Amino acid sequence: VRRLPFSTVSKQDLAAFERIVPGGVVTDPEALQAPNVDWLRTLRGCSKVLLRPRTSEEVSHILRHCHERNLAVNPQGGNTGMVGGSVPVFDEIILSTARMNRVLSFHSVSGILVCQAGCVLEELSRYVEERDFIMPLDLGAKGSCHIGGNVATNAGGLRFLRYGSLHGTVLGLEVVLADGTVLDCLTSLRKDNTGYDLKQLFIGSEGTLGIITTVSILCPPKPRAVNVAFLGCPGFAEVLQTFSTCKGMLGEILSAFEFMDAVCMQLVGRHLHLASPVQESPFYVLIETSGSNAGHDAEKLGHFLEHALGSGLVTDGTMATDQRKVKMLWALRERITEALSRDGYVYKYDLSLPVERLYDIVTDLRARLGPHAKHVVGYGHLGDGNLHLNVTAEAFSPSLLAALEPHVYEWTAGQQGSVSAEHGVGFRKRDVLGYSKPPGALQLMQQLKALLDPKGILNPYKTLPS
Amino acid sequence: PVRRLPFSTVSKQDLAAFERIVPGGVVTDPEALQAPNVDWLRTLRGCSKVLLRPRTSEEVSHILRHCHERNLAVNPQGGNTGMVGGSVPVFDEIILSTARMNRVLSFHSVSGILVCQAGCVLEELSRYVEERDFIMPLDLGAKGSCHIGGNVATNAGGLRFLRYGSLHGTVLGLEVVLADGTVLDCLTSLRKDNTGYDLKQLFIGSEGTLGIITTVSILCPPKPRAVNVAFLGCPGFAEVLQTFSTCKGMLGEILSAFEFMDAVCMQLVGRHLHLASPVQESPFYVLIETSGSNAGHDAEKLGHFLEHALGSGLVTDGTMATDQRKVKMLWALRERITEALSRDGYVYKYDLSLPVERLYDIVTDLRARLGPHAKHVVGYGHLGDGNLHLNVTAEAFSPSLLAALEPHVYEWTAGQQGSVSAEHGVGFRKRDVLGYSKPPGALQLMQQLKALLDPKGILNPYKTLPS
Numbered sequence: 001v002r003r004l005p006f007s008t009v010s011k012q013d014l015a016a017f018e019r020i021v022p023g024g025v026v027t028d029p030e031a032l033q034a035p036n037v038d039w040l041r042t043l044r045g046c047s048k049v050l051l052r053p054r055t056s057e058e059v060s061h062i063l064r065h066c067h068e069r070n071l072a073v074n075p076q077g078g079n080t081g082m083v084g085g086s087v088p089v090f091d092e093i094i095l096s097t098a099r100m101n102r103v104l105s106f107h108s109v110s111g112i113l114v115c116q117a118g119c120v121l122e123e124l125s126r127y128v129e130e131r132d133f134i135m136p137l138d139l140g141a142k143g144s145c146h147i148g149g150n151v152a153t154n155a156g157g158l159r160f161l162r163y164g165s166l167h168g169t170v171l172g173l174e175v176v177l178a179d180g181t182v183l184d185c186l187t188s189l190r191k192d193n194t195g196y197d198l199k200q201l202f203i204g205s206e207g208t209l210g211i212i213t214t215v216s217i218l219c220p221p222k223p224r225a226v227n228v229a230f231l232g233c234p235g236f237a238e239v240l241q242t243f244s245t246c247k248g249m250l251g252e253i254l255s256a257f258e259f260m261d262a263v264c265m266q267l268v269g270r271h272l273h274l275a276s277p278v279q280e281s282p283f284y285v286l287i288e289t290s291g292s293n294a295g296h297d298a299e300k301l302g303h304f305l306e307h308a309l310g311s312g313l314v315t316d317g318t319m320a321t322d323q324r325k326v327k328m329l330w331a332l333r334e335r336i337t338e339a340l341s342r343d344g345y346v347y348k349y350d351l352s353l354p355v356e357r358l359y360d361i362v363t364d365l366r367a368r369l370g371p372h373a374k375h376v377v378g379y380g381h382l383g384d385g386n387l388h389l390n391v392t393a394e395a396f397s398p399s400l401l402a403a404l405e406p407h408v409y410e411w412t413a414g415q416q417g418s419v420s421a422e423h424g425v426g427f428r429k430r431d432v433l434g435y436s437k438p439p440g441a442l443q444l445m446q447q448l449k450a451l452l453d454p455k456g457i458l459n460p461y462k463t464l465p466s
Numbered sequence: 467p468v469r470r471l472p473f474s475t476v477s478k479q480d481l482a483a484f485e486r487i488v489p490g491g492v493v494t495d496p497e498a499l500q501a502p503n504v505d506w507l508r509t510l511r512g513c514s515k516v517l518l519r520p521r522t523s524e525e526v527s528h529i530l531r532h533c534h535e536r537n538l539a540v541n542p543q544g545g546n547t548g549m550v551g552g553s554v555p556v557f558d559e560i561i562l563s564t565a566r567m568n569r570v571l572s573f574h575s576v577s578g579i580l581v582c583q584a585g586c587v588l589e590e591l592s593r594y595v596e597e598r599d600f601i602m603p604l605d606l607g608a609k610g611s612c613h614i615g616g617n618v619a620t621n622a623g624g625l626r627f628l629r630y631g632s633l634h635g636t637v638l639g640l641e642v643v644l645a646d647g648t649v650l651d652c653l654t655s656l657r658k659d660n661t662g663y664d665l666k667q668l669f670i671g672s673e674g675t676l677g678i679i680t681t682v683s684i685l686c687p688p689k690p691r692a693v694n695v696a697f698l699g700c701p702g703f704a705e706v707l708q709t710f711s712t713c714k715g716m717l718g719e720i721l722s723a724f725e726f727m728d729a730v731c732m733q734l735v736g737r738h739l740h741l742a743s744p745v746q747e748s749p750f751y752v753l754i755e756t757s758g759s760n761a762g763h764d765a766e767k768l769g770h771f772l773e774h775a776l777g778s779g780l781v782t783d784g785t786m787a788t789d790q791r792k793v794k795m796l797w798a799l800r801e802r803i804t805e806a807l808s809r810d811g812y813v814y815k816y817d818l819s820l821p822v823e824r825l826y827d828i829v830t831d832l833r834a835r836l837g838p839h840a841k842h843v844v845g846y847g848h849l850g851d852g853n854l855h856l857n858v859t860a861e862a863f864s865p866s867l868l869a870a871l872e873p874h875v876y877e878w879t880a881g882q883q884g885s886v887s888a889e890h891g892v893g894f895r896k897r898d899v900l901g902y903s904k905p906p907g908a909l910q911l912m913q914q915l916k917a918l919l920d921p922k923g924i925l926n927p928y929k930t931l932p933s
């Protein structure tokens with residue numbers, strides 16, 4: 001809210017930065033406009049300097065200068081973050097990883113990838129898929145998000161159900177600390193219990209403890225067969241039983257279980273002009289499988305589908321194994337987030353709740369907000385207990401905000417839930433962590449912040465309470 | 467040797483304070499304190515004069531508060547199955563045992579989230595969740611004695627790591643009591659939660675130097691409908707590696723374990739524990755487990771895998787079992803190697819991560835470098851994870867053999883950019899060999915964390931960071 005007492009970038013700093021990163025000092029005001037606006041376009045900084053380093057040493061030397069001079073630094077990846085973490089609040093220097101986009105190694109047997117933090121996820125998937133491997137994560141933002149940003153936010157995504165957390169799949173990190181110190185935790189070993197797992201501190205630290213410059217990550221083998229079932233369910237009770245049966249009948253081949261409601265389908269059709277492949281239903285379920293024997297998987301899917309259609313859990317369904325049609329079906333889920341931001345102003349919540357009542361809050365909000373909201377939708381990673389709750393209006397209303405907050409956060413807390421399951425904290429949620437974290441935890445976080453960045457030059461105004 | 471730091475000593479008034487804090491949980495008898503003072507390997511012995519056995523988190527909080535005010539050093543202990551001297555005192559540190567913190571708090575029968583006290587015994591937790599058709603995400607030969615809190619503190623790997631991965635992924639939350647007695651509540655029994663720093667991660671693998679784990683929340687995978695085990699003889703290590711490659715290619719996602727052992731391992735388990743080999747004599751053996759939803763499909767995958775393995779000469783003889791009794795018998799041949807080694811003599815133990823292609827090289831080398839001074843040398847362990855268990859046995863400890871083994875084994879590992887402690891951790895034994903696997907700047911940040919969280923250093927002194 002109020003600017004902390006940081007120094008201001010002088011002409012001497014610009015000349016220093018040009019020496020440190022020649023060719024990588026952008027000061028054109030119109031060029032700085034885009035990197036100052038977050039993905040949602042509701043926060044806008046006034047940074048006048050963007051730095052685009054190529055190597056880790058350049059990053060180390062930049063922070064060295066910023067440390068001695070007490071200049072605030074805003075690390076930025078793909079700028080797809082959802083919580084206002086990726087753009088300055090005032091005039092923080094934007095340090096972009098855009099040019100740190102080289103792959104450093106890939107071991108063709110272990111599947112271990114070492115790459116720079118600014119490699120785009122989409123591009124890394126292509127690289128390892130040419131070598132019969134896949135990334136352990138995927139997101140709708142794959143086209144723009146940087147692997148460094150994924151690690152900094154501890155991104156979940158669409159294959160978390162199968163491959164799990166970056167806390168498990170990240171093997172090593174190189175991090176540049178606030179004072180310029182290069183921390184080498186860039187191991188490429190599957191197992192290494194020689195002291196504290198220091199890298200874990202930086203996974204989910206959202207650039208407040210250091211800038212990730214190099215990532216080592218374990219890539220799963222590429223599946224021989226990927227199948228997608230897109231199913232229509234007549235209610236949420238059946239969605240939950242479809243999930244239960246899916247785990248019983250598909251089991252270890254399951255790689256994704258996503259859901260969306262009717263309004264979500266309508267919004268992707270209206271704003272993005274993507275047609276539904278099944279009959280209209282109140283709820284839709286996208287199931288993905290990944291396995292080593294295509295015939296065994298297809299056999300598992302067949303028996304699962306026949307009984308689920310037979311027991312009335314699903315009303316209408318379409319299956320796909322052709323690469324083109326799988327991506328078609330995935331687009332119906334992946335592009336919901338785009339359709340919402342085209343419907344007007346979006347109030348965005350990312351909650352962890354008990355799966356058995358994951359949708360109850362959507363129905364509650366629909367009764368609580370009547371004609372004062374345009375749409376209320378619920379979708380997301382049901383398999384991981386993670387609901388994406390969004391309310392749209394043609395324009396922002398302080399009334400509607402007062403109706404949504406703190407009510408939504410209080411409901412989640414009554415369920416011992418998380419007020420930010422995946423997207424993190426950043427600027428937007430810094431003052432609502434008390435609904436998921438007790439004061440002693442939040443205090444220790446501040447002590448770690450004070451140890452690693454005593455001057456607070458890395459990402460001020462985030463991601464800890466005011 | 468190592469010098470005792472200037473901690474206070476336990477007085478009669480401290481003993482009365484502990485009797486107040488945990489009624490009936492103070493053990494002072496020297497004959498009762500012998501056993502908790504000796505490590506599993508029986509090569510380190512402490513001189514602790516008091517064992518505290520709290521039942522509740524509040525009791526642990528109050529104990530540590532007193533020790534912090536009094537400047538009394540504390541040695542946390544679980545099952546005392548640790549392999550690196552971290553589990554017993556060096557001098558007269560108070561032994562704080564989790565033996566009586568053995569309650570399950572809750573288990574959600576759909577999400578599979580378990581919450582239990584740190585001192586619950588792994589095998590007992592497995593029995594509890596398996597009755598409800600879930601399994602623990604980790605298993606190890608120590609299951610009968612090790613505590614879940616110990617496993618988290620050591621970041622235990624084990625026999626199903628290849629399938630379910632690290633505790634850094636499967637632990638959902640922890641309650642931890644800090645050195646000053648502050649109860650840190652990171653007990654987030656949620657699959658996903660990105661509301662600030664993942665504080666629990668600091669305590670996974672910290673071996674009781676940053677706090678005492680009192681409650682664990684852990685994600686339990688579903689119990690597989692079908693479990694198969696194959697036990698195979700290979701004519702050389704190259705065929706072992708090709709058997710692994712082929713195994714991943716043909717079994718894929720149903721693979722739940724891949725373990726190897728050498729001929730000498732098989733001989734010792736047979737010689738000391740009387741377990742007969744079910745396959746023809748071979749220089750290497752491989753145990754494969756599969757876990758899946760469809761018995762028929764898993765059987766077809768396994769049938770074709772063996773067909774191809776026997777066809778191309780990768781495996782010379784093999785047997786398969788699905789009967790629960792027979793499955794356990796095959797698993798016993800691998801699980802009980804560690805017991806058989808310590809009955810054979812004095813054991814020099816090394817736990818190394820290396821490039822899988824050269825995992826066994828060190829065993830051949832050491833067999834040549836040493837001579838009749840080694841009674842036996844073996845190599846076995848978690849090949850799928852790149853993890854070798856190197857052991858050398860002898861009739862008695864000798865300085866000459868230790869000098870031949872060290873630093874040579876640690877230099878070999880650094881030469882391969884490997885880990886000198888893959889899973890067992892650091893503790894007392896390896897505190898001064900971290901330079902082979904971790905750079906100075908990383909080692910410094912760990913010391914700063916220790917100073918922040920335990921500025922008096924009362925929690926597990928003489929471990930697990932460098933001097």
Ligand SMILES: Cc1cc2nc3c(=O)[nH]c(=O)nc-3n(C[C@H](O)[C@H](O)[C@H](O)COP(=O)(O)OP(=O)(O)OC[C@H]3O[C@@H](n4cnc5c(N)ncnc54)[C@H](O)[C@@H]3O)c2cc1C
Pocket residue numbers: 039074075076077078079080081082084085086087097117118138139140141144145146147148149150152153154155156157158206207208210211212213337338422423426459
């Ligand atoms: C269409 C869409 C779909 C999405 N789907 C998902 C999803 O399924 N799951 C999910 O979890 N999230 C999802 N997200 C949001 C997700 O958090 C981001 O897309 C991504 O994880 C962040 O990458 P980025 O390069 O955009 O990082 P940025 O937005 O540039 O940065 C995000 C934060 O991390 C910090 N940071 C970035 N890079 C670094 C670095 N190298 N070192 C240190 N700190 C750094 C920034 O300072 C900021 O605080 C989605 C976003 C969009 C737009």
Ligand SMILES: Cc1cc2nc3c(=O)[nH]c(=O)nc-3n(C[C@H](O)[C@H](O)[C@H](O)COP(=O)(O)OP(=O)(O)OC[C@H]3O[C@@H](n4cnc5c(N)ncnc54)[C@H](O)[C@@H]3O)c2cc1C
Pocket residue numbers: 506541542543544545546547548549551552553554564584605606607608611612613614615616617619620621622623624625673674675677678679680804805889890893926
């Ligand atoms: C037969 C056998 C097989 C084994 N197999 C494996 C294997 O497959 N994989 C593997 O990784 N290891 C294995 N181990 C060793 C492994 O380190 C231990 O078995 C186990 O992980 C430690 O559990 P514990 O409760 O016995 O811990 P302890 O031995 O009691 O303690 C170990 C360390 O953790 C600390 N500690 C213990 N409890 C707590 C607590 N509640 N809070 C904080 N710190 C605590 C202690 O202070 C000590 O430094 C094996 C050991 C044996 C004897």
Ligand SMILES: [Zn+2]
Pocket residue numbers: 157380381388422
């Ligand atoms: Zn998401």
Ligand SMILES: [Zn+2]
Pocket residue numbers: 623624847848855889
């Ligand atoms: Zn082991």
